[PDB]
UniProtKB/Swiss-Prot annotation, chain A:
The RNAP catalytic core consists of 2 alpha, 1 beta, 1 beta' and 1 omega subunit. When a sigma factor is associated with the core the holoenzyme is formed, which can initiate transcription. DNA-dependent RNA polymerase catalyzes the transcription of DNA into RNA using the four ribonucleoside triphosphates as substrates. The gene is rpoB. This is DNA-directed RNA polymerase subunit beta. It comes from Thermus thermophilus (strain ATCC 27634 / DSM 579 / HB8). Belongs to the RNA polymerase beta chain family. The chain holds residues 975 to 1022 of 1119 of the full protein.
UniProtKB/Swiss-Prot annotation, chain B:
The chain holds residues 566 to 621 of 1524 of the full protein. This is DNA-directed RNA polymerase subunit beta'. The RNAP catalytic core consists of 2 alpha, 1 beta, 1 beta' and 1 omega subunit. When a sigma factor is associated with the core the holoenzyme is formed, which can initiate transcription. The gene is rpoC. It comes from Thermus thermophilus (strain ATCC 27634 / DSM 579 / HB8). Belongs to the RNA polymerase beta' chain family. DNA-dependent RNA polymerase catalyzes the transcription of DNA into RNA using the four ribonucleoside triphosphates as substrates.
DNA sequence: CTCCCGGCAAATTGTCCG
DNA sequence: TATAATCGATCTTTGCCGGGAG
């Protein structure tokens, strides 16, 4: 049953228990943004 | 002796401009890493042109 | 002339690199 | 500043362009 409507899904759907893992790649770690910041010595371009 | 000194001087100029181009690459003591000469700085994927100039 | 041989120059990108 | 001492010590991809030798 669709919890939004209450109406059934128009077809029977495969449901069961699956083993699913949370991998080491998490947004908290990867989100990054910069306006201005450190520059490199010789090139004076932003660091990495 | 003066001849030896002169040929060593050429090799010193050679490593400074393009190290490894002719002869054994000059290395810091106790490292196999060739020193990075002016030519190495200009050229290659890591060089001045393709690293800081065509993209930043 | 015509051809191997050697010497030199190249070999994807972001992230990361603890 | 003084016996004499006299020659060193490591090594394992593909495409293009120039040169000497056959």
């Amino acid at each position: 049953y669709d919890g939004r409507t209450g109406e059934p899904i128009e077809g029977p759907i495969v449901v069961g228990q699956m083993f699913i893992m949370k991998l080491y790649h998490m947004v908290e770690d990867k989100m990054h943004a910069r306006s201005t910041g450190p520059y490199s010595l010789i090139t004076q371009q932003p660091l990495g | 002796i003066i001849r030896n000194e002169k040929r060593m001087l050429q090799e010193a100029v050679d490593a400074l401009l393009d190290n490894g181009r002719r002869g054994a690459p000059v290395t810091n003591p106790g490292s196999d890493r060739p020193l990075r000469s002016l030519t190495d700085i200009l050229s290659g994927k890591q060089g001045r042109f393709r690293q800081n100039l065509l993209g930043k």
